[PDB]
A paper describes a structure:
In pacidamycin 3, biosynthesis the 3′‐deoxy moiety is mediated by Pac13, an enzyme found to catalyze the key dehydration of uridine‐5′‐aldehyde 1 to form 3′‐deoxy‐3′,4′‐didehydrouridine‐5′‐aldehyde 2. Pac13 is the only monomeric, metal‐free cupin dehydratase characterised to date.
Initial soaks with uridine‐5′‐aldehyde 1, the natural substrate, were problematic due to both turnover and the inherent instability of this molecule. In order to overcome this problem we used substrate analogues, uridine 7 and uridine 5′‐uronic acid 8, which enabled us to obtain liganded complexes of the enzyme, providing the first clues of the location and structural determinants of the active site. Both ligands occupied the same binding pocket in their respective co‐crystal structures. Comparison of the apo‐ and ligand‐bound structures revealed that small movements in residues such as K16, F103 and L21 create a pocket that encloses the ribose ring of the substrate analogues but leave one side of the uracil group solvent exposed. In contrast to this extensive network of direct polar interactions the uracil ring makes a single H‐bond to K16 at the lip of the active site, with more Van der Waals (L21, V34, V99) and π‐stacking interactions (F103) characterising recognition of this part of the substrate. Notably, lipophilic residues L97 and V36 border the active site, creating a hydrophobic environment and perhaps sheltering the substrate or dehydrated product from attack from water.
Numbering used by the authors: 1 to 121
């Protein structure tokens, strides 16, 4: 009766601000986990008032901007962003993202769009 396994085939998959998201559909108040694929960048800056965003970099190389501070990131690195921190990133990377407490779109806040020319990837 209990669903333990979620697959890519059954996931919701869409593009948002230059990234390709795989949202498995996990429901759990403690955290939710998604895949993020980025070719050149996440061309938007945002923050989340409630949840920490933890990015594990599966492959590739990029750079996060966290409250405007550059944080280089590469394969096998863990990037740990606390709540209420402005986020954007450039790069060519495959990542696994944890949002803890569970992602709620109501908690996210748009700061600005970013020109695609700003990414050096
Ligand atoms: O369940 C989730 C988790 C993350 N994201 C999005 O993934 C990006 C993470 O950088 C942000 O645009 C964030 O809103 C979603 O859309 N849904």
């Amino acid at each position: 009766m209990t669903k333990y396994k979620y697959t890519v085939e059954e996931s919701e998959r869409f593009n948002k601000h230059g990234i390709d998201l795989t949202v498995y559909g996990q429901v759990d108040p403690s955290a939710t986990v998604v895949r993020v694929s980025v070719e050149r960048g996440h061309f938007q800056e945002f923050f989340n008032v409630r949840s920490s965003y933890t990015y594990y970099v599966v492959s590739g190389q990029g750079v996060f901007y966290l409250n405007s501070e550059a944080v280089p990131a590469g394969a096998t690195d863990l990037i740990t962003v606390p709540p209420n921190t402005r986020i954007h990133y450039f790069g060519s990377m495959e990542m696994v993202l944890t949002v803890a407490p569970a992602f709620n779109e109501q908690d996210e806040r748009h700061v600005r769009f970013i020109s695609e020319s700003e990414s050096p990837y």
